[PDB]
A paper describes a structure:
Type-three secretion system (T3SS) are multi-megadalton protein complexes that are capable of bridging from the bacterial cytoplasm to the extracellular space. At the core of the secretion system is the highly conserved export apparatus (EA), which is made up of five predicted transmembrane (TM) proteins (SctR, SctS, SctT, SctU and SctV in the vT3SS; [name], [name], FliR, [name] and FlhA in the fT3SS). Here we present the structure of the TM region of [name] bound to the [name] complex, in addition to the structures of the [name] complex from [name] and Pseudomonas savastanoi.
We analysed this sample by cryo-EM and determined the 3.2 Å structure of the complex, revealing a single copy of [name] added to the previously observed FliP5Q4R1 complex. This extensive interaction surface between [name] and [name] reveals [name] to be an integral part of the core of the EA instead of an accessory factor. Intriguingly, the two helical hairpins of [name] are joined by a loop (FlhBL) that literally loops around the (closed) entrance of the [name] gate. The topology of FlhBTM is unusual; the helices 1 and 4 neighbour each other in the middle of the structure, whereas helix 2 and 3 flank the central pair on either side. Despite observing up to five [name] subunits in different [name] structures, there are only four [name] molecules in this structure. The unusual topology of FlhBTM means that a long loop, FlhBL, between helix 2 and 3 (residues 110–139) connects the two hairpins of the structure.
Numbering used by the authors:
A (entry chain E): 108 to 299
B (entry chain D): 106 to 299
C (entry chain C): 104 to 299
D (entry chain B): 105 to 299
E (entry chain A): 109 to 299
F (entry chain I), G (entry chain H), H (entry chain J), I (entry chain G): 1 to 89
J (entry chain F): 10 to 260
K (entry chain K): 29 to 221
The structure:
Amino acid sequence: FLPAMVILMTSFTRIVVVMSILRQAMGLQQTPSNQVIIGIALFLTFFIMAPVFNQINEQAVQPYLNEQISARQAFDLAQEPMKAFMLKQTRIKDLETFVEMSGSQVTAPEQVSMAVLIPAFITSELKTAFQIGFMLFLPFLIIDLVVASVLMAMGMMMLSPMIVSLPFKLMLFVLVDGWNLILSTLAGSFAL
Amino acid sequence: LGFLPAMVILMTSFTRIVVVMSILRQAMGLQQTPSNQVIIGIALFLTFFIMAPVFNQINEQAVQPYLNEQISARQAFDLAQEPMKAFMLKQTRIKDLETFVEMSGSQVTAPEQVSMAVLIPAFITSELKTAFQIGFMLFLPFLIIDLVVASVLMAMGMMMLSPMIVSLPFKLMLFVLVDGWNLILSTLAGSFAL
Amino acid sequence: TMLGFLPAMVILMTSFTRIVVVMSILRQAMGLQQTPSNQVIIGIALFLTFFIMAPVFNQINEQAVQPYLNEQISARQAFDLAQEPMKAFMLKQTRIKDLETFVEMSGSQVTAPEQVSMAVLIPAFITSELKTAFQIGFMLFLPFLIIDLVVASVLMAMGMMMLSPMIVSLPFKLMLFVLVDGWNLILSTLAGSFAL
Amino acid sequence: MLGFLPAMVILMTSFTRIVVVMSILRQAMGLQQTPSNQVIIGIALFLTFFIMAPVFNQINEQAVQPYLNEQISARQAFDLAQEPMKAFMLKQTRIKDLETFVEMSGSQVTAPEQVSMAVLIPAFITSELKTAFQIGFMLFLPFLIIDLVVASVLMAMGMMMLSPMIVSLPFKLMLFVLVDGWNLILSTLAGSFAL
Amino acid sequence: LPAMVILMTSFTRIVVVMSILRQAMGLQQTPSNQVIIGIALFLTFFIMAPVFNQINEQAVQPYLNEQISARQAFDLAQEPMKAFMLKQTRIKDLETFVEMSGSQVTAPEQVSMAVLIPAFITSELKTAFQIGFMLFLPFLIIDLVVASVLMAMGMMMLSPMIVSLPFKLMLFVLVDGWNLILSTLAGSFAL
Amino acid sequence: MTPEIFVELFKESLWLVLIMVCAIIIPSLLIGLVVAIFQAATSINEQTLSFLPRLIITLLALMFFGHWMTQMLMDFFYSMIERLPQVLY
Amino acid sequence: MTPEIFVELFKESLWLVLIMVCAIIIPSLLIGLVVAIFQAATSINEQTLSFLPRLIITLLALMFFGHWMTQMLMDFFYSMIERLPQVLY
Amino acid sequence: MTPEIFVELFKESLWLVLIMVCAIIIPSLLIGLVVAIFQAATSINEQTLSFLPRLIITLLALMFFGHWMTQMLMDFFYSMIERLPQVLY
Amino acid sequence: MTPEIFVELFKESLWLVLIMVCAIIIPSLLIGLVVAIFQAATSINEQTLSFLPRLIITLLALMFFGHWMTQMLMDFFYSMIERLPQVLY
Amino acid sequence: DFIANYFWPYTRIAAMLMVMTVTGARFVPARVRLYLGLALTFAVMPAIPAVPSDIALLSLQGFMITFEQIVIGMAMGMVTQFLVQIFVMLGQILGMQSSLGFASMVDPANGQNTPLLGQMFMLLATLFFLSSDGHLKMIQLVVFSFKSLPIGSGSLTTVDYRELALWLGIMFKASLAVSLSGIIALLTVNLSFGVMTRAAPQLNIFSLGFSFALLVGLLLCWYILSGLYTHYEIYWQETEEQICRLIRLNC
Amino acid sequence: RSKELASVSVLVVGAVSLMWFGEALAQGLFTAMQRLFSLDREEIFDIGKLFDIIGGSLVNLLLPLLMILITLFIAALIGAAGVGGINFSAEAAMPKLSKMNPLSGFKRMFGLQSWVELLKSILKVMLVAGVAFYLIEASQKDLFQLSLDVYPQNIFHALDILLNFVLLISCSLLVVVAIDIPFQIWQHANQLK
């Protein structure tokens, strides 16, 4: 029950949702094999979390290992960079809602509890996962609609322009260099 | 061994959140795009948030007092049974609970002094009813989009074009324009009236 | 050996599989991918089991286990006394046409059915339980099939041939379940089917 | 051996035909595992006791009843246990499969009752999964007809969508009650064994 | 650790072939992993009967009538077990594993048991997959024929995994299946 | 129950499907016929003109017949709930 | 059993599918032909007019042929139950 | 809630679908009628000429009515969010 | 075995799929062509008329070609069983 | 107490096994993989340099270094998973263009997908991985890593996680390179059915729907298999050089 | 009038114009996909700036698609007016009940015209099946060569042969329209005769 938790507190939620969005956008359903999707999203999370885990290591792990602070105090200190990361990805309203529903408000978002921030973090990670997601869908939907419009103006109206549009989607996704592009917009999205 | 883990899941208000968010995932037309595992994660955190009062109360009455231990298997188990039953009874409909207490045949003068084996069956048949009502309310805008897109397509003539590969970007727009997960996951938490 | 099979035999000696089969046929009738978890179905079935077999559990604990607390006799009165309420529960719910076959296949025919062996009784009970579970599930399926066919026909009449009348009919099924009170009716005919 | 004993006591008994037939049935019905595996391996385990009542009674009379008196154990008790089991299994292995496996073993057998246990059990399982596949294949056909008739009426009316498996599930549940269903199949799975 | 003895035998090829089979013909969770492990553990008792005879009547029974060093039995039990292993491993896999262990080139039948065990399990996995994916193949024709006969007339939605299952059972019965798979898996071992 | 009881029950179900589909689609089919008569008379060959009238009428017939249709489905569900005792034995 | 027995058994099954599908769809196809002849004669090009007649007739043919169809399936299930002994050996 | 409340709610939803589909398709149907009148008058039988005008007008009507359509959907979502308390009890 | 052997084996398998699918679907496609020529000649636009002829012919072709198809699959299974020794080494 | 000394090499090996394409797949019971990765450690025990002693297993310094090797293992076998997916995608492109999986094209949601040609080309990519001994090279690459990525001396750097998460683009490029010749032939047939529907609007999805595309998509899949090992040999060099850069190994 | 000349004039031109207008439609669609795939976390975290990107890309893309569809429009219009003219007779568009009379419909439905269009129909499938299958075979070697080619230029060389295949298959219907034109011209007189 620990892996899923630490996965949620990381960048995995936005990445894997964007992957599953793109897999439907392609039209090759289930072809990149959810094991592979999860593996690639997991490799990405480690690339994005390099600064965050480096901070967690230098602030808390390194003094604790060199016997410079206790264990509970190191555990408390380790949350400071995780929360510093998570606060940047949350939105102000999504934090205010989950703060108001506890009664005990905060003067600054740094004093919020964890069990109040993580719900406010995932609601703001799904929102931006969909904000990237429909921007992924649009290039493929336009190929679909252009193929459909040309096939319709031509007559046919019965060719189901989604079997004739799968190769065009694929050729154009790989020709525009595709993945690397969107890669650099899932890495820039988690800007510290 | 496998029957018990579902019991504490059913006891808390974890089922309403999962049923609503899964009916929602089906509405949006996404194929496990919010995967099952992340839905369970979201529902687990929302449960750690809704139950934060109940868990604080059991941390003050049943967990910390278990250090001097004072008590064993007689009133320490019932001590945990009490706050759970209070919350549950706060969230069960009267029409449901009067249907199960009449089936058991054991009458109680005070609806609070109901047996647990009659309250939890009366609590889940209300969680599921509420979850279906909420999820039904939420499905409707996405149904309107699915029908408007299908009608525009069928009008322009492209009959053989699925209005699901073309209505999904619009279902993701309308879900972001309205702030989406902010609203829904607020009315879910705002449904546990305490 | 016989420790990974006990959670499969204790739940069949009791009235647990009728509820699970009925509620899973229901979940399939909603046309809605699962969303009650299998854990949820199994859990509400386990609670309805304690809710239904209470007249039998309140005798197992009263006459067999709590006397086993004074202990008074070891592994004898329990083994040969917990059968009385279980047999009296199961014999009341097997169809005669369904138990005669297992008696004639066992080779031992007795005039009084109460004297039938337990190994002959339990299969007849399972066979009479799954039959009624399928009958109940088939009864409840039909309202969720009229909606399927009406929605599919309304869509196909317009020509909207690619709509998959399974997602548009999901709100109508989700409504019809709430209008007819759903879980109360179904989990109250399930709980009231074990008339004894 | 402790990690495999529950799987070894199963294959000597009638568990393996019944579980395979009962699990092909639920794939035929379209039930998305509505009898859980722990339900089917419970039903087929109760039927195993019901079927092997004649064998388990002989084992109890010849092994456990002398075990209570401790006359001779761990050498004779095991043999008196293997004998009725060998009689039960040997009355149901096809002669062709028994001969095939004996020839594979290479040992010369002149009395079919005198085959070793280690050549009989593997010859028994291959003649048990074959019977289970024939039975569960025959019980399928009345459901494939329903699937293919519903999936054709739907397509004739014009509805490419509307998966048949939901609209053809009540018809299969009906047919499986009109034909008495579990009373026919769980009886010809019990009259299947000559014991 | 005491079950590793069974993985030294011909247990890891039968379980894999049968796990490929049940997945080849339609069945999900039909004969469960436990049933397949049982049947394969009986087929090893059948196949490894000469090896178990060699070990019993030559290293176990003299140990019961001890007249010998206790550990010496593990020297006399290792010999007839290895002789079965070494006729099943490919020479290429054994040579690569000897290079990988770092030792110089030695003649086979002198390679250590610890180098032979992994060189045996990988060579049994190659064999099990190359046998199973060939038996898989006739059950992949019926899947592709059925799903092409449906999709030709349409129906778009009738699952080819429930309409082709009777045909798979039919073919597997007409061939007799188990008398050719469980029988050619016992004549699959030359020693 | 016997086979004839379940056949009687399926006749009830197919009759519901029939009268609901008729109630919703008869108006749409009538307006399709009318607008197609218009097309044929004015010799207009525009084979997707019939869609918007038929769709408006199907939506208005779902609005008009929606209440008694949901009442008829609700009464059918209830009538198969009282029909359960004679399944029980 | 031998291969020819199981082939004979599948001919029985495909024959059932054939006669049931024919019984249900022949009336619907006939009314489709009739209403399409109407469309062609009156030069009406309204390609979803044929749906409601064909659906009404398919439902009425499921009501009319439903009893003997369920009897024919029931007799087939029974006949494959008596056919099990010759599988057994 | 009661059945009549949910029926009232579905009338709201079907009314939204109706007015949106009308707003988007009425211009396309009008231009289809106009270009088909042209075809009939000039006796031109070219049955896919109507596509590009109808598509341009559907895209321009999605551009023109897009703002108030998204506002109307947004207001509907909000109005079913304030309607949740009377579901709650 | 080498890669070219397994490629040769998959050519055998795809060839079986090809000739079976052809044997079963060529008659259905021919009758689809014939009935579609009928529709085009009589100017009948009834796009589900082709289903029952094509289905009857597919069932009759499964009845006619069923025996040699099952014999061809059986011979293929046997030929991959004799092909196992050269896998063994 | 062998396990305290050789738990980290066993962790790297057993983590590569769980994901590797052959041994770490369905069809192999997890106990077999466990007792395989446990037997491999005894064979390569000489070829493993000394682990960092003074680091206990049940300690933060131990859990860190154990996870840093589960990561290396998973990252090594996942590349062969990508290599096999390159060919599964071939099958599920030529199958979805021949309309063989078509309910999942109109319904990218629940739908109804038939992964048949995907399963067939998965069988190819596995029989090629086995026939041309890819698993032996895959194990040699791990055993070389205990001297190139030693235990307790660094792990995959951040430049490697990005280069490794770019393999989805390489998979989509390879599955298009292999099946471009099938894509062109299948589109020339789909559009020919389209010209049939244009010239004579009676030919429908019912009249001859998906019957030409299906035969031609099977014939193309048959014709592709001949020159399909020349592509596996191309992409196995990439899949092997990637791992030979992950464990630097100067290759 | 002719119903096949109008059917081939659309296909031939929908391939011909598709060639040169697609050399730029693919470029516009490429740039649109490239712009929509690249975002920088300020365009992400506020949904006011993504619709600007969407509009810009869409507008840059609308021109080649509209240029495709306007020449398809013109080809369809000129194609059907190949026989006859554009005389605007406002009387043919007024409701006349004599057009839907079943007697005249039956009479024009059967007769020699049904036989000749049945001949054309069994020819419209033989051509497209003996050309689309001839070209898929006569071009076997070059088409199998597309897999083992340099990367960026094998996709281009494949799309530059798909369009030639399409042009040939859509031009092979010229004999179908060639047997139709004199038949329709002869109908224009025998009905008067």
